A paper describes a structure:
Oxidation of Met to methionine sulphoxide (Met-SO) damages the proteins and can alter protein function. However, these damaged proteins can be reversed by the repair enzymes, methionine sulphoxide reductases (Msr). Two distinct Msr enzymes have been classified for the reduction of Met-SO: [name] reduces the S-form of Met-SO and [name] reduces the R-form.
Our crystal structure of BsMsrB was found to be identical to the NMR BsMsrB structure and was further used for structure comparison. The specific activity of BsMsrB was slightly lower than the [name] activity of SpMsrAB and of mammalian MsrBs. BsMsrB also has a low Km value, similar to that of SpMsrAB for dabsyl-Met-R-SO.
Numbering used by the authors:
A (entry chain E), C (entry chain F): 1 to 141
B (entry chain C), F (entry chain D): 3 to 141
D (entry chain B), E (entry chain A): 0 to 141
The structure:
């Protein structure tokens, strides 16, 4: 009803909350996944649902995790006119946590650079996908 | 959560009991003498099965109860090993739990004897934290 | 006994040690001797001394072999106040191994009920008491 | 290896492991831990812990035992085996002097060799554990 | 000593054992396993397992730590130790390179040395076992 | 102040040294080489036992003094561990301090070897505000 997600959120730490709940952003380079390259999945830190895979991730120099594309209708994009700018925010569909923004200067074909906060993700190694419950995606590798 | 994988991650005795319908030894458990307050969930489904409210100080060697939770535990006719007893198991996680005998504190006069190795205990002060908020009213 | 006991103890499997030396209890309906009903002699698994008889072994629903009463003075009753309780333990004399416990809910004429672990016992058929050196007890049949 | 250290490890090996590595036995086919194993990692000598084969050179065989196209470094050794009345090439680990199995020239190229090894003489180490357990020096193979 | 093996043994050490041997610490005096130990045997490296001292050269000391007059076959090495603002001589294991302790020239022997070793860095092996343990190689010492 | 409760809040080492007459590791404790002007007190009774004026360098790895302060310290034969030594314990709290050896820097030649584990150092610039003014005169 209203105590699984509302509870998970309550158990988040300062930054994780600030980001996901207050749409803030973590420091560049001083986060956990910006340079991380282990094979695996990046799940919603709140709803636990798959958001990005280690395969679409790449090396940018912005200081935050960067992917070219997201996962199956699990990540939503929406206009963000806040802060006197005009950007495209990225949020998760199920847990509606702020993730970050998309930019059109990526390396992929479509040229998208999904710039996400480490603080909104729980990384799950490939050798643990089946245990955690992500056998359904174990093929994406 | 995946029943198949979680079961596959249970301890030998937790598997033996819940899956092979085994019986853990007496007095050598974590909940036979347990008297703390809170819920006892299904080690597999996480669904609550018994409450500290109904638990009573029996001296048979396993955590006994006078009453189960609003049907989360079912009664099955068990005629194994030459006897005619009443087996108790979880409807959702379908885990073996134990047996129900007609010899408890009453008025039910029932002694739901359950294996510790089939139950995870969730402290009464960590229920809203673990998501068992709709059960706190029972305390 | 002396050193025989040592090598003899080193023989026992995990459960027999846990039971006989560590006073643990084997699981119910899941031991070799609760069913049995075989005409023989239940010997001490450590000292080889006769502890119980197949004749004094009655059917029970507890799930452990049970005997109305033991043989010789090889079985000894000790006041057991283990686990915040008052009971009556039973152990062999010569070997000093935990057998189990006795009660007063068993069939008369004495009313006692010796509930011993299978782990602490070693069966011996009637056809083998003579050759196995138990000639002296063979009369009990 | 040092007498006591080797002796220590040998003392650990269960029946089958001891039987094959020390007595040159063979494990039943299709009934061993690594024939169909395919997880990316290192196949380590169960006695000396020295790496013997990599998952990268393992191939699906229908013989029933883990098959590799080649061994790692000079740790695996070939040796004439005229036992049982025939002529085959045995393979043993140099350090532990552990009997591994045999090599056949019916392997899937390029060298056409088929190293048929018993799981009983190996201990798999996952790639994601390599550094942690002190196999960094091999982590480069992946 | 091979890195991977080295690591397995270290992972096996307990709190204090790790602290001393790895972090160069010292176990509490009089409250260790071999200070008052006096059994005919070998005291081997708890990591490399090589023999470090003999029960023979071990002697009673009121210091509270295994005291030996000398080590065996250069498996123990001395090294200057100018830490804690003092001047002492550290004693280290060759193969395993674990802190053992210190030496002092206040020994009772013909050469007056006093090797003060933490029990934690040691694992006693009785003589009547030396031959099955793989130490057949040292039985002659006794 | 309460004895049982004052000690019930002690450290693993503190309780060991203090209560079990154990002893800490050399060079690996708070004051073996500490030389700040002030007084060392009983972590338990909070009473003065030594002054840094009596503390000196000892390559043994444990704070060492040539003498204690008044009656807070008592001597006692400790023929344990198969040897004859002279233990030092506190008068009030009755906690194991360590031992006295007759190899000190004199003039008495006594070396009081104490465990940092049974001490609380108090700097001269806090002696008053802490209540040890009547001791401050010792500097």
């Amino acid at each position: 009803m209203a105590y699984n997600k509302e509870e998970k959120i309550k158990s988040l730490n300062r930054m994780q909350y600030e980001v996901t709940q207050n749409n803030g952003t973590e420091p560049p380079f001083q986060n956990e996944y910006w340079d991380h390259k282990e094979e695996g999945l990046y799940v919603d830190i709140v709803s636990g649902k798959p958001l990005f895979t280690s395969k679409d991730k790449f090396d940018s120099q912005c200081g935050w995790p960067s992917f070219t594309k997201p996962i199956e209708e699990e990540v939503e994009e929406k206009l963000d006119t806040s802060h006197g700018m005009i950007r495209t925010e990225v949020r998760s569909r199920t847990a509606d946590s702020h993730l970050g923004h998309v930019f059109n200067d990526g390396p992929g074909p479509n040229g998208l650079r999904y710039c996400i906060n480490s603080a909104a993700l729980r990384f799950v190694p490939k050798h643990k996908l089946k245990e955690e419950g992500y056998e359904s995606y174990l093929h994406l590798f």
